[PDB]
Write a protein that binds this DNA or RNA. Structure first.
Ligand SMILES: OC[C@H]1O[C@@](CO)(O[C@H]2O[C@H](CO)[C@@H](O)[C@H](O)[C@H]2O)[C@@H](O)[C@@H]1O
Ligand SMILES: OC[C@H]1O[C@@](CO)(O[C@H]2O[C@H](CO)[C@@H](O)[C@H](O)[C@H]2O)[C@@H](O)[C@@H]1O
Ligand SMILES: OC[C@H]1O[C@@](CO)(O[C@H]2O[C@H](CO)[C@@H](O)[C@H](O)[C@H]2O)[C@@H](O)[C@@H]1O
Ligand SMILES: [Mg+2]
Length: 580
DNA sequence: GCATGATGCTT
DNA sequence: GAGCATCATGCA
């Protein structure tokens, strides 16, 4: 039942047709400077397997890869593009990416290989990658015969599935979303990842040493106050010290045992001096283990750069994620952790970091979609939205809004931006679910348009089976009809929140595409380095800062036209820390 | 070795 | 709330 193909010893003309399904296999999860283990090509002339050493050395094949007029259909083209970039080879003409197509059709399926995408259309003549390569320590590239058949079968699947996937995308009015947004963005992400971000390793190592000293000191104080040594990082061992030896009250429990989360510890601080030290230990340990040690582990020793990998096909909101290292959660709230950003520097001499972020894009999107008169007017006046929200829900003038009032209004807005439940709000504000509900009710009284939107979108999700974003991204919500309160409730919150978060995701993605086109037209050397949800980070010659101050915000603010203005703040400096 | 729980960082 | 990590702990 095997599939016929040619195990080529050399590249031939028929292998270079103007349309083909192409597989450039990179098995390592992190594809940066990784091996390409095999190549498969499927076109009108047949199916072929090529050894990388020969194909990638062949002038004709390389030229074919870089020829934009020679169209290729692939799965996870970014992976191939980046691996090739590390080899000095350009990949152009990718007209269809099955990974992104499957992702847009249904992001909940978690499609991570050709077999999974193929199963969506009842095509199963291809094996899952895990079945071929294995997992974990058992992972390995199989003998050529097995490897070759697998790559050819993946190419064959891509060749066959392009049409049915494009047809459904078209039916969903998502064809442009794929071809004009996600695929072009994939190439931009490839460039960003390959460029990488330069790291001041000496700085990190310095901080690391200072942290180690501070950790040792606090660690000893903890054992001193506890009257014995124990594993502080062990909730079980810590729980015994706090709730048994010291008799602190148990305010919250977890499946396993006593909760020792920061939230719980804060409340116990008044009872014993050991508590504040545990909190301080947790903070220092977080910075040391996750950030300092974590970053140093993935920095390339030769260039001192980190090359993250953006997962463009994971979230059901349409936002991008980042891994190895995750550069979307570097500390900023507290000054101590914020200092870590001083370690991210420009990659060239006399260059600077330029960062631009949307100001409240989620709430502005909500104002637009819900057509709430009060919210739209607030943004048209460029009001401090948290202060404004406080004025309305607490019924007071601007000068009557106290700091605590603004903080709680901000939390209410935070809940709307991330679609948290009333229990979530209650927990965040440390108040009763009942009081949190009253805040929500007060908010809806002040923003009736938002209330109407929330009611209507849940109804629409139920009727159609999914909700959509500004650029037609879709999220199916089968749990919307569940008779299990918690399950149904979460689905309703996602129905309300996905159009907001998802539309904001669509906007910044388009902004990235528009920005790169503008940078090219303007002949600027400036280039994108990172995307952190509502923020874009670039680096460029110091001589280009003034031009970027006008160009970047303009492009970002004009990415789309909403019923309210889009506002972008920006700053630049010698390090990411200073770009604020 | 590897799965899962508790924890905490960002937006 | 999600996605990404950590370390500890159990088992396997
Ligand atoms: O290449 C990224 C792309 O690959 C998938 C699998 O198809 O994820 C793999 O690579 C990621 C980055 O190294 C890992 O986080 C993930 O664990 C691994 O399976 C897609 O999800 C992703 O879009
Ligand atoms: O020195 C390591 C040894 O100490 C214990 C406590 O007896 O844990 C300490 O060190 C760990 C690694 O530095 C921390 O994770 C932990 O929080 C700290 O108390 C033992 O578990 C370990 O064998
Ligand atoms: O009381 C109506 C109000 O309830 C919500 C949940 O807060 O939805 C419930 O009632 C709907 C009937 O109109 C059902 O479709 C839905 O499944 C049920 O949870 C709100 O959406 C609605 O405004
Ligand atoms: Mg912002």
């Amino acid at each position: 039942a095997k599939m016929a193909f040619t195990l080529a010893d050399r590249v031939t003309e028929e292998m270079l047709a103007d349309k083909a399904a192409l597989v450039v296999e990179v098995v390592e999860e992190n594809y940066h400077d990784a091996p390409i283990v095999g190549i498969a090509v499927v076109n009108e002339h047949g199916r072929f397997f090529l050894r990388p050493e020969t194909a990638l050395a062949d002038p004709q094949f390389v030229a074919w890869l870089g020829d934009e007029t020679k169209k290729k259909s692939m799965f996870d083209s970014k992976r191939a593009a980046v691996a090739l970039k590390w080899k000095g080879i350009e990949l152009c003409g990718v007209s269809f990416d099955l990974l992104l197509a499957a992702y847009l059709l249904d992001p909940a399926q978690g499609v991570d290989d050709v077999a999974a995408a193929a199963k969506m259309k009842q095509y199963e003549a291809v094996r899952p990658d895990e079945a071929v390569y294995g997992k974990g320590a058992k992972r390995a590239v199989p003998d050529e015969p097995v490897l070759a058949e697998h790559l050819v079968r993946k190419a064959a699947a891509i060749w066959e599935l392009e049409r049915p996937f494009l047809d459904e995308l078209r039916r969903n009015e998502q064809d442009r979303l794929l071809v004009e947004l996600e695929q072009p963005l994939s190439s931009i992400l490839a460039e960003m990842e390959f460029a990488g971000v330069k790291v001041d390793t000496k700085r990190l190592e310095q901080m690391g040493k200072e942290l180690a000293e501070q950790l040792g000191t606090v660690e000893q104080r903890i054992y001193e106050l506890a009257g014995q040594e124990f594993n502080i990082n062990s909730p079980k061992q810590l729980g015994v010290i706090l709730f048994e030896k010291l008799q602190l009250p148990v305010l919250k429990k977890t499946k396993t045992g006593y909760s020792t989360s920061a939230d719980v510890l804060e409340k116990l601080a008044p009872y014993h001096e050991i508590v504040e030290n545990i909190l301080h230990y947790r903070q220092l340990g977080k910075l040391q283990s996750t950030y300092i040690e974590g970053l140093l582990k993935v920095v390339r020793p030769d260039t001192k750069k980190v090359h993250t990998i953006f997962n463009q096909a994971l979230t059901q909101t349409g936002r991008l994620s980042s891994t190895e290292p995750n550069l979307q959660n570097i500390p900023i709230r507290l000054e101590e952790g914020r200092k870590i950003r001083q370690a991210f520097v420009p990659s060239e001499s006399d260059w600077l970091i330029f960062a631009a972020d949307y100001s409240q894009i989620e709430l502005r999107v909500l104002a637009h979609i819900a057509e709430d008169d009060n919210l739209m007017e607030a943004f048209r006046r460029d009001l401090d939205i948290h202060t404004k929200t406080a004025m309305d829900i607490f019924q007071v003038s601007e000068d009557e809004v106290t700091p605590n009032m603004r903080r709680q209004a901000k939390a209410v807005n935070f809940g709307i931006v991330y679609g948290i439940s009333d229990y979530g709000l209650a927990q965040n504000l440390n108040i009763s679910r009942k009081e949190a509900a009253e805040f929500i009710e007060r908010y809806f009284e002040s923003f009736p348009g938002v209330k109407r939107y929330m009611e209507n979108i849940v109804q629409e999700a139920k009727q159609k089976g999914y909700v959509t974003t500004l650029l037609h991204r879709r999220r199916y919500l089968p749990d919307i009809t569940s008779r299990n309160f918690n399950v149904r409730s979460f689905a309703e919150r996602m129905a309300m929140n996905t159009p907001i978060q998802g539309s904001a995701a669509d906007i910044i993605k388009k902004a990235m595409i528009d920005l790169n086109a503008r940078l090219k037209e303007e002949r600027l050397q400036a280039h994108l380095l990172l995307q952190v949800h509502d923020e874009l980070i670039l680096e460029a010659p110091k001589e280009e800062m003034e031009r970027l101050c006008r160009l970047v915000p303009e492009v970002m603010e004009q990415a789309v036209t909403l019923r309210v203005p889009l506002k972008v703040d920006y700053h630049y400096g010698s390090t990411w820390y200073d770009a604020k």
